From a paper:
VanS is a sensor histidine kinase that responds to the presence of vancomycin by autophosphorylating and subsequently transferring the phosphoryl group to the response regulator, VanR. The phosphotransfer activates VanR as a transcription factor, which initiates the expression of resistance genes. Here, we present X-ray crystal structures for the catalytic and ATP-binding (CA) domains of two VanS proteins, derived from vancomycin-resistant enterococci types A and C. Both proteins adopt the canonical Bergerat fold that has been observed for CA domains of other prokaryotic histidine kinases.
In particular, helix α3 occupies very different positions in the two structures, being positioned much closer to the nucleotide-binding site in VanSA than in VanSC. Notably, α3 is involved in a crystal contact in the VanSA crystals, packing against strand β5 in a neighboring molecule in the lattice. Hence, it seems likely that the ATP lids of VanSA and VanSC can adopt a range of positions, and crystallization of these two proteins has selected for two different conformers. VanSA is an exception, as its α3 helix lies closer to the nucleotide-binding site than in any of the other proteins; this likely reflects crystal packing effects.
Residue numbers in the entry: 227 to 322, 340 to 375
The structure:
């Protein structure tokens, strides 16, 4: 009988990252309906998103935007972090203090999935969680 108000969880995280991001002229912007909700362990999910943003911040190019889009489509709530810059493909095949291994099991324990891709222009992290 619980739920996470996702937009506001993402906002709080973004605000914790603001000093680190502004120092390189970066900016995280959230695109999401504010009505959007999901089930799960709130403090565990916040750590998932924190770890991912930590990765986006580390591989994001100076003076660029980190987009965090979240939406409900069918049975899936998806949260997608996209940044300009690339993860070296050897660090990328290893990705599962930037290790997303715990993030992954948290999401997996939630019945969800994490996708990471990277070309050489931008990097995408995608979290999918079951919808209520």
């Amino acid at each position: 009988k619980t739920h996470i108000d996702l937009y506001y969880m993402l906002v709080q995280m973004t605000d914790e990252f603001y000093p680190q991001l502004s120092a390189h002229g970066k900016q995280a912007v959230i695109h999401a309906p504010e009505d959007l909700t999901v089930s799960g362990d709130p403090d565990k999910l916040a750590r998932v998103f924190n770890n991912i943003l930590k990765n986006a911040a580390a591989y994001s190019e100076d003076n660029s935007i980190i987009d965090i889009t979240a939406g409900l489509s069918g049975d899936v709530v998806s949260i997608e972090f996209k940044n300009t810059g690339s993860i070296p493909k050897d660090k990328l095949a290893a990705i599962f203090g930037l290790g997303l291994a715990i993030a992954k099991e948290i999401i997996v324990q939630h019945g969800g999935q994490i996708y990471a891709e990277s070309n050489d222009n931008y990097t995408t992290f995608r979290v999918e969680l079951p919808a209520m």
